[PDB]
Design a binder for these strands. Structure first.
Ligand code: MG
Ligand code: MG
Ligand code: ZN
Ligand code: ZN
Ligand code: ZN
Ligand code: ZN
Lengths: 162, 162
DNA sequence: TTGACTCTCTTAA
DNA sequence: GAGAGTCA
DNA sequence: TTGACTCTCTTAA
DNA sequence: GAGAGTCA
């Protein structure tokens, strides 16, 4: 099994490679009518992606390193968290983008949490709009807002009460 | 079926049958430290469920009627909305529980909206905690809260900025 | 050891 | 959150 | 015609 | 949001 030093070396090589990805400046809503700026380190759209990286799905990548003749592979956003617990409250931990930009691999834009917590950030009002996440959001979620509901609650007769 | 008259008849028979489901009172968080009361009309746990109803999954049911000698079948919660557009902005419309209680078939607890809008209600602060849904929530979402994030954003080196 | 592809799986609406 | 088939 | 089961599918994290 | 195989 890989030692602590070996895991730290994997994290360090990953950071060195991701740090050379193109850095894209994005202006984003923070909530409360505030606007802020995020700097995403974006994996390229097509090969080559960077040393150790390969695409396993339309917006899925993996990081691969060979250590003492054994091939090791991780989801490309999971590498910053290899020294952390991998479950909590009986739920698997997932890499969660605070910038909501799947191509971004900036570890300052990632956290490590259940899939439900991860999904819920899509609707958060944001750090200046009422975010209650203990690990605070960096921006208002892209799906926050009044929504586009087509039809609301209704009945034709009188069989129901709310 | 095809005619507006036939659709209204389907909706009316569905309402009559669901109106005889047991009414279960649920006390719920509204947000803002307030509590309210919902009256859910709950489909039985096992057969028989009611005229026209059958279970296709652990918490999935279908309503079926024979019109013009043809069988017509629909998701059990979609029947109130048979006269509404079945898509919005190119996204499929779904039956969405405002009470977050899948066995409930009270149409006063249902709306018709995209799957994204539907999902997002799980994290809403609620009608007394800041809900901005244009079709307002009936309760705070069951997943609202600080979350249980295991690890936040971090880097080992100095290659990244937020 | 490495790159660039291939495939299928999990969750909860 | 969905659609559709097999039996009786 | 109605009931009670069976199976797989969609979406976007 | 994930893991794993093939081939050169
Ligand atoms: Mg996410
Ligand atoms: Mg729902
Ligand atoms: Zn980013
Ligand atoms: Zn938040
Ligand atoms: Zn209900
Ligand atoms: Zn709401």
């Amino acid at each position: 099994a890989l030692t602590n030093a070996q895991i730290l070396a994997v994290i360090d090589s990953w950071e060195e490679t991701v740090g050379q990805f193109p850095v894209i400046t994005h202006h984003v809503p923070l909530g409360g009518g505030l606007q802020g700026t995020l700097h995403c380190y974006e994996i390229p759209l097509a090969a080559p992606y960077g040393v150790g990286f390969a695409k396993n799905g339309p917006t899925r990548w993996q990081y691969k390193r060979t250590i003492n003749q054994v091939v090791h592979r991780w989801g490309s956003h999971t590498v910053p968290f290899l020294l952390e617990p991998d479950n909590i409250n009986g739920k698997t931990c997932t890499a969660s983008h605070l910038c909501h930009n799947t191509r971004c691999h900036n570890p300052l834009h990632l956290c490590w949490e259940s899939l439900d917590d991860n999904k819920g950030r899509n609707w958060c009002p944001g750090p200046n709009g009422g975010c209650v996440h203990a690990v605070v959001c960096l921006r208002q979620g892209p799906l926050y807002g009044p929504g586009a509901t087509v039809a609301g609650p209704q009945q034709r007769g009188s069989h129901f009460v709310v």
